[PDB]
Design a protein around this nucleic acid. Structure first.
Ligand SMILES: [Mg+2]
Ligand SMILES: [Mg+2]
Ligand SMILES: [Mg+2]
Ligand SMILES: [Mg+2]
Ligand SMILES: [Mg+2]
Ligand SMILES: [Mg+2]
Ligand SMILES: [Mg+2]
Ligand SMILES: [Mg+2]
Ligand SMILES: [Mg+2]
Ligand SMILES: [Mg+2]
Ligand SMILES: [Mg+2]
Ligand SMILES: [Mg+2]
Ligand SMILES: [Mg+2]
Ligand SMILES: [Mg+2]
Ligand SMILES: [Mg+2]
Ligand SMILES: [Mg+2]
Ligand SMILES: [Mg+2]
Ligand SMILES: [Mg+2]
Ligand SMILES: [Mg+2]
Ligand SMILES: [Mg+2]
Ligand SMILES: [Mg+2]
Ligand SMILES: [Mg+2]
Ligand SMILES: [Mg+2]
Ligand SMILES: [Mg+2]
Ligand SMILES: [Mg+2]
Ligand SMILES: [Mg+2]
Ligand SMILES: [Mg+2]
Ligand SMILES: [Mg+2]
Ligand SMILES: [Mg+2]
Ligand SMILES: [Mg+2]
Ligand SMILES: [Mg+2]
Ligand SMILES: [Mg+2]
Ligand SMILES: [Mg+2]
Ligand SMILES: [Mg+2]
Ligand SMILES: [Zn+2]
Lengths: 206, 78, 155, 60, 70, 24
RNA sequence: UGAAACUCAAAGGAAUUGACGGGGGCCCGCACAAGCGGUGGAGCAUGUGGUUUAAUUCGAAGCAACGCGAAGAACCUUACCAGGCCUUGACAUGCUAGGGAACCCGGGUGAAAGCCUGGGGUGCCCCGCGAGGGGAGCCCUAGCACAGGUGCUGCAUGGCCGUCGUCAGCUCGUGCCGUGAGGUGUUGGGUUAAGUCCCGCAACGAGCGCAACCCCCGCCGUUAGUUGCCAGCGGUUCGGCCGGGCACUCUAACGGGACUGCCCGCGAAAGCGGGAGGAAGGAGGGGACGACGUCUGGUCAGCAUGGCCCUUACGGCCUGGGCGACACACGUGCUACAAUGCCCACUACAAAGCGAUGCCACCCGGCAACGGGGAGCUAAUCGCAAAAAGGUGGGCCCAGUUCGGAUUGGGGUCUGCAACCCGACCCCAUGAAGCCGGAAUCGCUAGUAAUCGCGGAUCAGCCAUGCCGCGGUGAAUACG
RNA sequence: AAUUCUAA
């Protein structure tokens, strides 16, 4: 039981926060809690888009909610009916002005949280896990990258003998700071155990 | 230890007090072992709760500042 | 110390006599790293010297510290079911440490209630080749030689 | 005694003495920094995600 | 239940446990309560006295006879 | 010693003030 | 010379890969040796076993469980027990009916919970001034679908984590040898902290690791001035107090600097010894980071979740007890057994943090804890604040003592509904065991060990001697 | 010059 998050380890440099906004020791608590309650509701109704990240900025009494996705669509609808009823539901429990937004992801295969939910789903849909892994990695490295790595926890295939199937390709130095490696983690939920999946996508550097 | 007051639970006095007018019976249950036995109580036995049941603890002069909880052991074979 | 032959940390010259050894001796009188309340004691002794011998506290050192240097002591070894505690030479370096150490230890034994007195006195008697510290010198030297039977065992 | 418990850490019935902290993500009752309002676990798990403002793993 | 006990005998052994343990217990209507618990009791738990700690079984008997003719 | 509640270090090691250690 | 009955599902040959050896070769770690201070003994604090008990909640078990979850158990917390109550309920969701749709202060009774109960009146959709009730909030009770569980399984699981181990390793593709398992690469020769690099070589490259990128301490400079500063004069109630000045100090932000680059000696190289310049050399001192995997390790009690299980109770609520029990035994610790010392008064020197029903200047009453008053502060500019050992001059004069503060009597203050269990300091009186610790056993190789004091998280208060940090003084020794 | 470690 070793290895620590490659994100909170890059925070300093490489990776940026995911919710930057100075705050006073009299507010930080309530506000920080707000970001969560927001990431929580947007978690459900948005899962169909692939909420691969949610950066939240705030100058004061406002919010910079930004749902980056590789596939918007359901985010808006076809003009502004959906994406409008969400700005609605948001501040519909937030006394502030929920300035909503929606970004785009060119290569969704080069996005961890995504590739994660990906395999994490082929699982709940009873698929050859030995494959889903060797295939999903065979999607990244191919669709342009430098490193790939997937990991699935015990209960694979349903065997009472809880395993842990590896499978990676390319390069993934979690020890090297100057590298920037995208990390993701989804949780398949089957009839038996509760599998777990990890995604490792290596990209640039220096 | 208190310095300004006598932290004696409400039901404690209110009961006992009226019990002093003409001197009522005696069997007076309780759950306020965490109170005090101000003078004038002498003679009146109280059914203190040791956590399990009511202990027929008699009251006398000497024992005053002491409390009701300080008269009903709570464990056995000390 | 399996790799490097370690290093002989350096003693900074005294701040009165300017002797790199007059300190090494104080260091041994140092409890809790309190060198001020320690070196002081030493210095209160040098005045116990010039006041019980015109002899200036320097040779009362180069003598008491020289009359304590054990020429040879015993370092045990085991060839196999062998309780042989071989006698052997002493490192010029080591000698001093054994000296200074035994000087203090011995000192801390005398019935002198103060302190500098003990160091002062012990320094005189040791200079005078007859201090509790020299008792440890011969005692140590007795073991040595007395067992020259194991001269072919100087590991 | 977990859910029906956090459902009383919310209110402030008789006396303030019974007012006690409690993590927010979960019902953690021990080791909760009034500041963040999160337990030591949640706190660590978040700071890793980056979801914690101006927070970052120290090093000296 | 109130009954008292008298450890007639008790002896350990080699590795761990107990070799033989015989006891006498009194108290109104006693035999009638322990007569039923007469036979061999089985146990299944992780054997401490094992390296792998495998799941192991154990058998030991409990006899019950009343103090009659003296 | 660091336990004599009626002395100097008595209060120092303790972290309090009393007749044996008034506040300056 | 030489069977059988019975019995087993193997017995066995060779060759792999490992693990192991009271085998061997080479090399490391406070492993030993070298050396200083402790534990084991005493008293107490604390965690554990045991026992006890109505209950003394549960988990953790060599290292790697035991000041561990617990970074705050008087009711709370709380999972335990005794007693008094409540059932769609403390909470989610949808729905059902006449009620009803924001709603507000009590009365009675009881230990509280709870049962019961005495009044205001609903913006409004608005046929509509109206009767009425459509009426959105949406509370009240009955009914339904369901909720709820720190109940069990850590060998059903995730995540996170401990550990071997910061060890120098574990692997891959292709080719080549092998019938094959598998081997070569990764062995060998030299080197380092290292599978580090070099040199060979049926091998040639490559991946996870080490290293490096990152942060802290060091030296230097750039930008920056309400910190600081007669550095220079100034006026100075003589406190950078003041105009005044960024020079220092320093604050925090971006750079520079060290690379075996240079010389000498070895050498095939790598690289080692050693020289000078320099604040610093051969990873400069500390952090960060911890591989393929191991221990059916730890964790269903943080949480998530499969399966089992109780669902007017294996749920919920309150009062009270309990977790604080004590003939014992073990671990981690605090303070001591004194003169390198203890007591009394005086005088100095830090760092890192931290403060709105908060830290308290300074006054005042009180021997004091503390308590009345009260200014400063959204905090480099005020407060916690005095650091302590030390410096100092003086009282003890080797005695269970002016050592030691356990125990206990009497009297108080503070938080809090309330300190009987079961709180923390204050004061007077008690002044116990211990005169350096059996067999054993622990830590530390340098600003380290020892010793000294301060702050922070938790938090009303606090059982904190615990844990995470900081700096004052400052060693001994390493043959091997 | 030094014993032993059952059986899922
Ligand atoms: Mg009682
Ligand atoms: Mg609390
Ligand atoms: Mg035997
Ligand atoms: Mg046969
Ligand atoms: Mg063979
Ligand atoms: Mg032998
Ligand atoms: Mg040693
Ligand atoms: Mg002891
Ligand atoms: Mg359990
Ligand atoms: Mg341990
Ligand atoms: Mg506590
Ligand atoms: Mg409680
Ligand atoms: Mg409870
Ligand atoms: Mg329970
Ligand atoms: Mg496990
Ligand atoms: Mg190995
Ligand atoms: Mg090989
Ligand atoms: Mg390598
Ligand atoms: Mg090679
Ligand atoms: Mg070198
Ligand atoms: Mg296990
Ligand atoms: Mg276990
Ligand atoms: Mg659970
Ligand atoms: Mg939960
Ligand atoms: Mg019933
Ligand atoms: Mg209790
Ligand atoms: Mg406990
Ligand atoms: Mg105020
Ligand atoms: Mg002052
Ligand atoms: Mg001592
Ligand atoms: Mg070391
Ligand atoms: Mg030395
Ligand atoms: Mg045998
Ligand atoms: Mg065996
Ligand atoms: Zn939590």
């Amino acid at each position: 039981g070793n290895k620590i998050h490659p994100i909170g380890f890059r925070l300093g440099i490489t990776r940026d926060w995911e919710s930057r906004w100075y705050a006073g020791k009299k507010q930080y608590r309530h506000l920080l809690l707000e970001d969560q309650r927001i990431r929580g509701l947007l978690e459900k109704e948005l899962y169909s888009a692939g909420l691969a990240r949610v950066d939240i900025e705030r100058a004061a009494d406002n919010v910079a909610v930004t749902v980056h996705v590789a596939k918007p669509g359901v985010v808006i609808g076809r003009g502004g009916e959906r994406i409008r009823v969400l700005r609605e539901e948001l501040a519909k429990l937030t006394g502030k002005n929920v300035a909503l937004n929606v970004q785009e992801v060119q290569n969704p295969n080069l996005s961890a949280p995504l590739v994660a939910q990906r395999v994490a789903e082929q699982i709940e849909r009873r698929f050859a896990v030995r494959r889903a892994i060797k295939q999903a990695v065979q999607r990244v490295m191919e669709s342009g990258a430098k490193g790939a790595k997937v990991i699935v926890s015990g209960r694979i295939g349903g065997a009472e003998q809880a395993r842990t199937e590896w499978a990676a390709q390319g390069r993934v130095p979690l020890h090297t700071l100057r590298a920037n490696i995208d990390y993701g983690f989804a949780l398949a939920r089957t009839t038996y155990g509760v599998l777990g999946v990890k995604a490792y996508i290596f990209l640039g550097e220096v | 230890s208190l310095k300004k007051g006598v932290f004696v639970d409400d039901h404690l006095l209110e009961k006992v007090l009226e019990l002093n007018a003409k001197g009522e019976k005696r069997l007076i249950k309780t759950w306020s072992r965490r109170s005090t036995i101000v003078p004038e109580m002498v003679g009146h036995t109280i059914a203190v709760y040791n956590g399990k049941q009511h202990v027929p603890v008699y009251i006398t002069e000497n024992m005053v500042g002491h409390k009701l909880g300080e008269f009903a052991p709570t464990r056995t074979y000390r | 110390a399996r790799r490097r032959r370690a290093e002989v940390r350096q003693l900074q010259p005294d701040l009165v006599y300017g002797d790199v050894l007059v300190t090494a001796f104080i260091n041994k009188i140092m409890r809790d790293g309190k060198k001020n309340l320690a070196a002081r004691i030493f210095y209160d002794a040098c005045k116990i010297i010039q006041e019980k011998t015109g002899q200036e506290p320097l040779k009362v050192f180069k003598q008491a510290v020289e009359n304590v240097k054990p020429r040879m002591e015993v370092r045990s070894r085991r060839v196999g079911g062998a309780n042989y505690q071989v006698p052997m030479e002493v490192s010029p370096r080591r000698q001093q440490s054994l000296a200074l150490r035994w000087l203090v230890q011995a000192a801390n034994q005398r019935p002198e209630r103060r302190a500098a007195v003990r160091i002062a006195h012990e320094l005189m008697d040791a200079a005078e080749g007859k201090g509790g510290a020299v008792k440890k010198k011969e005692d140590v030297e007795r073991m040595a030689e007395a067992n020259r039977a194991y001269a072919h065992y100087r590991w | 005694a977990r859910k029906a418990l956090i459902e009383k850490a919310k209110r402030t019935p008789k006396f303030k003495v019974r007012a006690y902290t409690r993590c927010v993500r979960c019902g953690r009752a021990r080791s909760v920094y009034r500041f963040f309002g999160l337990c030591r676990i949640c706190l660590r798990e978040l700071a890793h995600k980056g979801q914690l403002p101006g927070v970052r793993k120290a090093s000296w | 239940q109130g009954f008292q006990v008298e450890v007639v005998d008790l002896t350990p052994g080699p590795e761990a446990g107990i070799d033989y343990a015989q006891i006498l217990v009194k108290g109104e209507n006693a035999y009638g309560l322990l007569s039923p618990e007469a036979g061999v009791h089985r146990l299944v738990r992780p054997s401490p006295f094992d390296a792998s700690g495998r799941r192991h079984t154990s058998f030991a008997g409990v006899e019950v006879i009343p103090e009659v003719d003296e | 010693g660091k336990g004599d509640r009626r002395t100097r270090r008595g209060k120092i090691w303790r972290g309090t003030y009393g007749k044996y250690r008034p506040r300056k």
